[PDB]
Amino acid sequence: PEPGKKPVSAFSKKPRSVEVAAGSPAVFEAETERAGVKVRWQRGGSDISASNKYGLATEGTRHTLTVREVGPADQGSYAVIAGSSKVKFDLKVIE
């Protein structure tokens, strides 16, 4: 059987998988139980940072990731790490 309860985690809300069309904008919302900690985002094999093409919005305990250039390239998996907590989610793109 499964353990039952996971080790203490830093995410209040886990980002959930969604589906996006090619050229269609994509927005992900994630939340953390504790504030004051930077949240790092990872794309299938490449890290995501607060720079253009990608958008990071950090308000209080809420972190938002926005991708407007998402296409066939982005098909894969995304990982997000807040402090010591490891979590990942899948993005689906249809041609």
Coil/strand/helix, residue 25: coil
The phi-psi region of residue 2 (left if phi > 0; otherwise alpha if psi is between -120 and 50; otherwise beta) is beta
Stretch that binds another protein, among 8-16, 29-37, 45-53, 82-90 (CB under 8 A): 45-53
Give me the 46-65 binding string for another protein, x by CB under 8 A, dash otherwise. xxx--xxxx-----------
Out of 1, 45, 60, 95, the only residue in the binding site for another protein (CB under 8 A) is 45
Name the DSSP class of 73: G
Residue count, binding to another protein (CB under 8 A): 12
- E strands along the chain, which residues? 19-21, 26-31, 39-43, 46-48, 54-59, 62-67, 76-82, 85-94
Complex with another protein: residue 13 or 68, whichever CB lies closer: 68
Instruction: Provide the binding-site residues for another protein, judged by CB under 8 A.
Output: 43-48, 51-54, 69, 73
